[model samples]
Target: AVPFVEDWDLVQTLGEGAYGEVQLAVNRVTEEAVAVKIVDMKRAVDCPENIKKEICINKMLNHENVVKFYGHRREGNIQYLFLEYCSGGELFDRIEPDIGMPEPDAQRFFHQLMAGVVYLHGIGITHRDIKPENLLLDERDNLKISDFGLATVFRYNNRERLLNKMCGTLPYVAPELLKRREFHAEPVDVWSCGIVLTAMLAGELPWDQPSDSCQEYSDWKEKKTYLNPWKKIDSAPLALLHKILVENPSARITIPDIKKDRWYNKPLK
Candidate 1:
């Protein structure tokens, strides 16, 4: 048996990806439950830097809303990354597109999600991909941001800049990215957060695509009504949602602003 695999008991296969598989495991000595992501070195050889960047970024980030990175090691051709085990699974699992979820429940998750984004941007890192699938929930139902494969550090010496890369899930992507041009890091996240909030409340995407070609998206771009969930919510939350959903990056609501919203301050039921 490989020395690295000997220290942990592979309880079950959690999921698989193109690079390798993630396993639910327990530390043989500590009996600590963990999620081990084993990646094939050969498959990741082309972009070794990506793997390094992910590990580095996650390790540096320490927040309650962010998944904790225990440590990493390698043996033979496989690299194992130890991550916080999210027993409740992805936030995606809890959401039902047709039925959506209660406004209060959605509010708690959105608040936590935004808090994590605030920390990430505070550190000058942009999580290029923010979607339901990437947001995991612990046994307590608290949300934690995960998956840093597409994340990038955009600042140094306290200087932040615009990023040009077009990456992330289509449904949650910002419009500026769809325009195929350089964009600010913070606003893009606010746009995606808006989509996430909408999904939690509506149980489905507000638009088929973010492009103006989609009438639903077009109406949304023009701030027109289209059987939206936001319209059904209280004026405070609806107004805050509109601020976050603004298509123009320059006018989009910032994370701190989200914290200041009266609706956001309401105690979760």
Candidate 2:
């Protein structure tokens, strides 16, 4: 095992990427457990700006649900960041191949997640990707939003910046974003959150229908007379999704409107 400079002992591999590996380490002097993300410049030089942005944003962000960010370590070409570790692994790993989380349990998680999303937006940040995998659980099983390499400042760049790219994991992507049309990050982000919320409650995605072309996506999102599980999720919490996932950006639910929904204020069951 190659010894890390400044007296840190490598414990194990946390995860890996094109740039390098994230490792579990112990501070030799302080004896605290810390996760070190090691980025090799040889592989990361091509996207140095992204690496810088991720580090900068993570540092600027301070919230309960957002993972805590420690300072970065640079030795040679390696960029090491000490981050809070969530041993419970990705939330998606706990879900899927299973149906129906208790309604109240799902509600609590969704509420906290909404708070995090709102905070990000207030700071001009867009998570851009919100899915089960990005939601990590701490030792106490509380949720923490992690992984922000794809996050960007809302309105920081022209819509075409990512239009030619359309970056992010597909299943959780919003329709308007996929269509490469100019749109507000907040509603699109909310749409992803609402979809994730539905998946938590129902153990299935409402828009999992096969979609390729604009026409297919339009049909999938048209709520005027859209069918499939609508009646089943017609109650307060569920109806919130119907409004947020509208095909047209003009008609999509805004953050303030969703915060006032009955579902958001429903008494705990």
Candidate 3:
């Protein structure tokens, strides 16, 4: 008899999307938890580059805050990607809306967020999408950046190239994407991180989008933020947010520059 079986079984489906479904599986022997993202070969055929890019990018990355790729296998028409399981849920659920998360918690989460982002940039890949929804928490409450669906290499073989696709930014858009302009990958990630930080601290986005039609962004364009979150954010983080959310990518703060700030280096209490 042929033995074609799962190493992890009786999986519970965690979620699904157009491409595939991700299921929670326990180790067949040790009972350790893992996630199996099942991709249908026929369905993913239309977007093979994305699947190729995701595996390539995530495979090279090894950081605590970055979701670990435990490798993959192809069983006939189905491709299964084994990944680390995070039971604590999405960072989206942690936000309390208006009231926001406590400073200490936000501080720790934001710290891990930057650690992951910096590590991504330090290598050559850009996450493209960086938001609370894409960030997950493990059982130990550590942050793990997930969903490399749009992530790509901004620099490879010591060469950095401009990206033409404006595929990033959901609740928060970088100004360049709004104009459909080609952009540098690094600054867009920096901007989205700012957006995530604002949401964590204020429990709501600072603006609808970076486009002119959005009045909130218009207010920001005039150097005036009439939003309640602006008024409520503390002075230090507000300073950091302003630096990160700059309209001009060149004028925007880099992760390296962020380390120089007093607020950035402060210990979380």
Give TM-scores for every candidate, taking all chains together and pairing residue i with residue i.
Answer: 0.91, 0.82, 0.92
Q: Which stretches of candidate 3 lie over 4 Å from their true place?
A: 1-6, 43-45
In the range 22-58, model 2's lDDT, one tens digit per residue, is: 8888888776776788876664446466677888888
Model 2 deviation from native, Cα RMSD in Å: 4.3
Q: Candidate 3 — which pairs collide?
A: none
Worst-scoring 10-residue span by lDDT in model 3: 1-10
Candidate 3 lDDT over residue span 1-269, tens digit each: 32433467847988799768899998676788888888776744454556766777778989999999999887777777888899988899999978679877987898899999999999998888888878999999999999887898889889999898878766666888777568888999989998988888888887778877887777766767444467767778878888998989989999988877667777873
For residue 240, model 1's alpha carbon misses the true position, in angstroms, by: 1.9
Between candidates 1 and 2, the one scoring higher on TM-score is 1
Candidate 2 residue 43 Cα shift, in angstroms, is: 4.7
The TM-score between candidate 1 and the true structure equals 0.91
For each predicted model, how many residue pairs clash, with residues at least 3 apart or on different chains? Answer: 1, 0, 0
Worst 10 residues of 2 by lDDT: 156-165
Q: Candidate 2 vs candidate 3: which has greater lDDT?
A: 3
What's the residue-level lDDT of 199 in candidate 2?
A: 75
Q: Candidate 2 local accuracy as lDDT?
A: 0.72
